[PDB]
């Protein structure tokens, strides 16, 4: 069938970065012209391969990773980055083969009153492994006193929320991200 990129890009609801969505695109024919022929996008950076040639290439599985982050966080969604988001939320492998596509989400994900429905992992006692997800709400202890799951001095709830009022400067504004990843596994390619 025609391949469900609409669902991923035109989704009303976007996951938080710490809780990031992943969709497996399979047994479909993928147009991709629909992406690089758009002006919505702020960023369309491909590492494995070339955006224009993707429609003339074939792949074993493709995955679409959707989330929301701050504007000045989009540069963390790349091979070789360190930072809150790359460290404790979404990490791309050094050998990442795929496209980071993002776009300014002020219209949708910013409330005049303020939207705090979007969270990021502020603290973790080790960096994530590439394409690892972690929903822990375990109280993070950086104090000598161990918390007994009871938040307080040096006992922070690990998830934190974004201030997304729509008049925040573009750095602090919301952007939706979609990371397409292309795996050439030993099996027959099911999506070109």
């Amino acid at each position: 069938n025609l391949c469900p990129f609409g669902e991923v890009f035109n989704a009303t609801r976007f996951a938080s970065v710490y809780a990031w969505n992943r969709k497996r695109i399979s047994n479909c024919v993928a147009d991709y012209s629909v992406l690089y022929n758009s002006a919505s996008f702020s960023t369309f950076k491909c590492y494995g391969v070339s955006p224009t040639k993707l429609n003339d290439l074939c792949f074993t599985n493709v995955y679409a990773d959707s989330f929301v982050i701050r504007g000045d966080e989009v540069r963390q969604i790349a091979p070789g980055q360190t930072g809150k988001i790359a460290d404790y939320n979404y990490k791309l492998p050094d050998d990442f083969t795929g496209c980071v596509i993002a776009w300014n989400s002020n219209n949708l994900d910013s409330k005049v009153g303020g939207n705090y429905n979007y969270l990021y992992r502020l603290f973790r006692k080790s960096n994530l492994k590439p394409f690892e997800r972690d929903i822990s709400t375990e109280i993070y202890q950086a104090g000598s006193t161990p918390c007994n799951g009871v938040e307080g001095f040096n006992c922070y709830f690990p998830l934190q929320s974004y201030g997304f009022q729509p008049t925040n400067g573009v750095g602090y504004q919301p952007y939706r991200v979609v990371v397409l990843s292309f795996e050439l596994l030993h099996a027959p390619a099911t999506v070109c």
Partner: antibody
Amino acid sequence: MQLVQSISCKGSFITYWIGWVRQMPGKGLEWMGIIYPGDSESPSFQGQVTISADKSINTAYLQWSSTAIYYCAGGSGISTPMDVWGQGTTVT
Amino acid sequence: IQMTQSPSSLSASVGDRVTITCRASQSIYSALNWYQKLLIYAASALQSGVPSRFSGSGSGTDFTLTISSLQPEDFATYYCQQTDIHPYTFGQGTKVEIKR
């Protein structure tokens, strides 16, 4: 939230702890002590000053019987420490 | 616990990468604040409304502080502290001045 200083500190989610920061001429931050207003409960300032409170007015106090600014700090959240302060109290 | 903080003297133009290190009298894990106003808390966490230029890395009895491209307003002196145990004794001090 904010804290307004006079020798006392009051302010107004309302802060769950109030400590004391003093500043001698050409000096770094110095911590005086603590007194949590709800509970109403430094070994180098211990018996150099007296640290009292009044929960009703959301007031914390620093008193003597015997030269600097006096800064009271609290928390807008139970998690986050040292978040907002007063404007300071200059006594010479 | 008793704080260090080094150096007291730094000269640098606008935009320069800046590196400052504050030592720990006894292990407080990561219960370290950075003040200029609270800037960085718990070694690497950023107080809301503080620019992302500022970054710190530390754990146990050892920590640092980083500024990507020095803005004019960032010129000042910064002091660490411990949130481990009472009393919450602050650091010595550290001050940064423009190179001309």
